[PDB]
Design an enzyme around this catalytic site. Sequence first.
Site, short mmCIF file in Angstrom:
data_model
loop_
_atom_site.label_atom_id
_atom_site.label_comp_id
_atom_site.label_asym_id
_atom_site.label_seq_id
_atom_site.Cartn_x
_atom_site.Cartn_y
_atom_site.Cartn_z
N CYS A 95 -0.65 -3.81 -1.74
CA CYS A 95 0.58 -4.53 -2.08
C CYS A 95 0.26 -5.69 -3.01
O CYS A 95 -0.54 -6.55 -2.66
CB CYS A 95 1.28 -5.06 -0.82
SG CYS A 95 1.41 -3.91 0.58
N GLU B 287 -0.83 2.35 -3.30
CA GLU B 287 -0.15 3.02 -2.21
C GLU B 287 1.09 3.74 -2.71
O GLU B 287 1.90 3.18 -3.46
CB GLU B 287 0.22 2.01 -1.12
CG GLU B 287 0.89 2.62 0.09
CD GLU B 287 0.49 1.93 1.38
OE1 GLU B 287 0.83 2.45 2.46
OE2 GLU B 287 -0.17 0.87 1.31
#
Lengths: 70, 97, 533, 100, 540
Positions: free
Chosen positions: C296, C330
Amino acid sequence: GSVDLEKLAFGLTKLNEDDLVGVVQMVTDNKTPEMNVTNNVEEGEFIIDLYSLPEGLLKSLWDYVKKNTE
Amino acid sequence: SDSDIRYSFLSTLDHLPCELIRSLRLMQTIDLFKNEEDEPGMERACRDLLLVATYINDLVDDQIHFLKQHKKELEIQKSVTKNFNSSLENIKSKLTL
Amino acid sequence: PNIEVSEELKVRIKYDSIKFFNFERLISKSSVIAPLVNKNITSSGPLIGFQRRVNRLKQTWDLATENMEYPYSSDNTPFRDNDSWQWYVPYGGTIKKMKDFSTKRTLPTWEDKIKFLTFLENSKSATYINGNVSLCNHNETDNKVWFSQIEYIVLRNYEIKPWYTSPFPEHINQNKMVFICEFCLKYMTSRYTFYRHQLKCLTFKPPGNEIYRDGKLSVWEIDGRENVLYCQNLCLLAKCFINSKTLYYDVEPFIFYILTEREDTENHPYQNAAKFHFVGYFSKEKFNSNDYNLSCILTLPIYQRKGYGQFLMEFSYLLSRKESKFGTPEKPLSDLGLLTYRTFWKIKCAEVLLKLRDSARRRSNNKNEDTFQQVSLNDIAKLTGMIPTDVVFGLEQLQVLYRHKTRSLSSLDDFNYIIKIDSWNRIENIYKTWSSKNYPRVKYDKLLWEPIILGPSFGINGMMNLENYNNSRAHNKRRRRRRTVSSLTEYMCDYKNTNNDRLIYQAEKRVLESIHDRKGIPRSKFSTETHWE
Amino acid sequence: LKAELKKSLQDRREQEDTFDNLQQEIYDKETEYFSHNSNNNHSGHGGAHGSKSHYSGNIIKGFDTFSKSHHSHADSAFNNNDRIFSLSSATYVKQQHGQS
Amino acid sequence: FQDFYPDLNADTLLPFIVPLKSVQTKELIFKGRVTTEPLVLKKNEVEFQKCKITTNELKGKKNPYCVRFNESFISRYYHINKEFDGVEAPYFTKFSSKEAPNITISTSTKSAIQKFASISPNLVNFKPQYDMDEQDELYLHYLNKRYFKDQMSHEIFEILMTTLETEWFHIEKHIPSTNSLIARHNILRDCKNYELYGSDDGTGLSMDQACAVCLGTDSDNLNTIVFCDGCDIAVHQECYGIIFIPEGKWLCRRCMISKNNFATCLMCPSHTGAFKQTDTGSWVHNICALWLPELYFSNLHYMEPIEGVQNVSVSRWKLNCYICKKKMGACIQCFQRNCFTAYHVTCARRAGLYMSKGKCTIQELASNQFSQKYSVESFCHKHAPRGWQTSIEGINKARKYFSLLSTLQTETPQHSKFNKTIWKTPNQTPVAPHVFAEILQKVVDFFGLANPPAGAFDICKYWSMKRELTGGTPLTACFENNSLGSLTEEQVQTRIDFANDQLEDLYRLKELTTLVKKRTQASNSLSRSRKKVFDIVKSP
Ligand SMILES: [Zn+2]
Ligand SMILES: [Zn+2]
Ligand SMILES: [Zn+2]
Ligand SMILES: [Zn+2]
Ligand SMILES: [Zn+2]
Ligand SMILES: [Zn+2]
């Protein structure tokens, strides 16, 4: 109404500088939607709508100006 | 009843060798690939060698210090549990079964 | 001049904002105005969070005050009388002497509680104008407890409209503004609290070691549980700018790399410390089989127009190259993140292809021109860092990967897929899109770092339920407990193999020369233009 | 000049002797370090005055020896590979390469 | 790639070939189906502002406090008023001790900090950790006008409060958590509380504490129930989002942020059991956020953030709970046909209303989407189905619990070997004892201030009340969550011997690494000398 708003404005004009700053402070704290208040903090002006101000803050300001003018 | 006494000591048992091996391999990499003739190369190499040396020394030192504090707090809590049991024996009358 | 009143009963005033915000004057005048509060002052709008707190405290101490909605139920257990064992074994017995564990002279009395509440009410008129009110505002245009009332966020000097409401503690979120220290990442409401915290946090640097320092930019490789509080604070700040950063509390694993814009301020003749203004970060998992090198990421809105986002992705991929492992961000991704990765994968593949071109043109005269090379997905991946799936998905956006229509699979010698550069001009412009940008690029020599060699813990100070060797070691070492060994002992002696090499430039030169020495292809096998789409 | 060569190379010789002695120091010191577990678990001297602390192995190499249920003889010896602290410098790795 | 074409592998030697409007799609591996859509993306404009005044102009105008002793300590733990920018400047590690602007650590500073450490063994390596707020400025005014004769400074008060915090946290850490005796007392108290009033936490049903969120008694190597060191809550790992369990202290999100408070569940009167936060940040019951339809969990594998706060329609709000009748929070509705009654989730639990999560796992329950297959069946005391017993007794139990909370809010506690020392508060907050008063007194003497012991007691009472205000959450951001706690004396003995051996190991390790640093500096000098000789040997 338990307050005479014209004479209240007269006493507001009589108040000194710091008293005005304190009026600004208390109004910015107790600003509610039913009141019409505007504050240019960037430039530093302050306008309050006396007719929309409720009797509570009105009487509070009245006590304030009594204390700080007499 | 008991537990794996390493699990409470994960820090010094595991993460001390982890970071130690890591910084050592890192110093090894820098020295092995310190281009001998390269002037700024060897400058940066020697500087980072001294750096990681200070780092590993301070890491083992800091883990020593944390284990010292842990020993002190451990024996303190030992005497404290002594106090606690010695006291709590008496109130068995008030405290329910 | 300083005041006027219009006939419509509106009072125009003029005051100095600095004098208005000065803390000492503010709190003095707050104690002045304190008693003048008319308890019947209307509350037909936003109920003050500070007033909610103080009314909670009042109804807690059972000082009967129901001027507002209602008091709340769960306050205590009925057995606060002399039956609780804690009243006969104070402090678990941690204190021995009676003259030291007695409290008859400190158990607070009704009068002391009244004094405390009096200071509180004298502060009420000071807090709303300190925390909830802003120092600057521009609100351009085109009950209230269920959702947030947060309206700004102040890092080092700026204010910020938070794009998304973060899960701060109610104490902080029901406020209007919230200051968050740039270094400590502590979040406090009152600008006074922030003043003192800025007076105290003399550790002008973030924690964790430093693995990159060029010019003004710098990175800090903050571990995941060497300092868990700082990371929880950082995550709670990050949720204000990521839509799907939900892993914001249990951050033991994530090795938060944190970008910063170092600044050398010697304005005062005494202070000269390197103020390390936090700028951007990218949480990266500590061990992930799914090949993620950036879980992130965000740069702060206050620091945009500087390409720090692209820089931070480029740094994530430099890190992956250094680890000599294949990773991709991700997959559940920001819609905006999807497009920025489209752009970045396109640019990276174009850059790799340009390096290939320049090397082949170094070898242009000596190697025959009709001889074509054969590069591979792995050849590109060992160069960039992205997995081969990522490389093909970032090449198709570049439109340089062509295939054959029919399948003459009878002869395996036939070419199936090709890389067919339409125009070196096209590719050089696609890459030069960055040249005119003048973005901060990862100078791959400054990085001082090595992989995160896990033991049996994998880095966390606990255990979680989740390549295959350690992934089975975790589950095997898991065994029940209520309230075969010796990993990594050989990671130092992994140099004796040449299959995996240490430095990124070594890996690059290796794969590049390997492909240069790979067998060539004549321009004549498939020169049919139609057959390549 | 030649005098500069003499002074610099004598400084270099002295520092090289110091460096080799530090090499040997780390060498034999980790030797003793990894033999301390063998003289600390089976015949406990330092980590135990009497035979009570059956977990007296070593931090780095010993993971199971730090468990009283470890009653075997698996971590009694070592190899020149496990000697991590020596391998740190590259000069030692090159010398070991020459001696291999 | 693998979804696009399998006729291509990574290592496949693809021939490089180069002779001598575009609207983008959108992939997604969602439910096994890829996606396709033109280039439409977020275009919201960002907004910020560089404020025109810092706290620099907002600093105090006057310094009316004269700290005439330990002023060096104050100014060195506070602030009152090619060399640095080269590659030579090393990379700061996580152990870089500050030797930065005008620190100049003097013997006076060292004597001062050693005196501070000798004030109490708990204050070794002290650090001011609390920032006084607006309401505290007034209390400091009142103090320094009543006791300390206009000589105590803001930093003085901060340091006092931080010593209080440090000492209290040391006592907190060394507090014994549980023995067999006090654990039996706690479980018996919980059994009584449930058998009388009712429990929306799962406690009391059996001596084996049940799951809080899912009311289950299953525990296997992948879904093992955890226990919290802050309260008697037990939650399945999957049913609560316990993605990892640290080795010692496990604290729920409540016991970690709102350390022990009985904070408010925005959709319930009751304030016990499992909790998570919201996207806004108010502690919502997990069982609530599950069973309330418009409330949904974001990260199903963490279950952490609750969302849907503003998405609930006012019908649910203005619905009434026939159990507690508090006119607040949200309320689910029964599934009985022609029925419209409502009640809070935990209210139904405590009163023993027929609830059924169906065949949907708790993951499928927080899945944010209820399918026609999903049936979260809750009923009324007259709408409960067969096999379930009428819950009139459960209604009585819930009414008793809540009317009991009310009569407590109305009632007052009606007031030599014997010693009934009271060191907590009905909010489970501390009460700084006489030894803490003595410690503060020592600190004031250290700083050389007019030091009324009554003033010390006042500061301690003020600290207790400050913590009661903050609501359990520590005054400062201090944490040593190593769980000395529930250990036993014998376990501590094993750990002390283990730590002795490890201390010997680490001592010889620091010996080795000191040799390493020495040899590394040696090798640095070696490279330097090699250059210093070869420069002239090779180049005249
Ligand atoms: Zn700070
Ligand atoms: Zn469960
Ligand atoms: Zn808890
Ligand atoms: Zn609830
Ligand atoms: Zn109810
Ligand atoms: Zn019903």
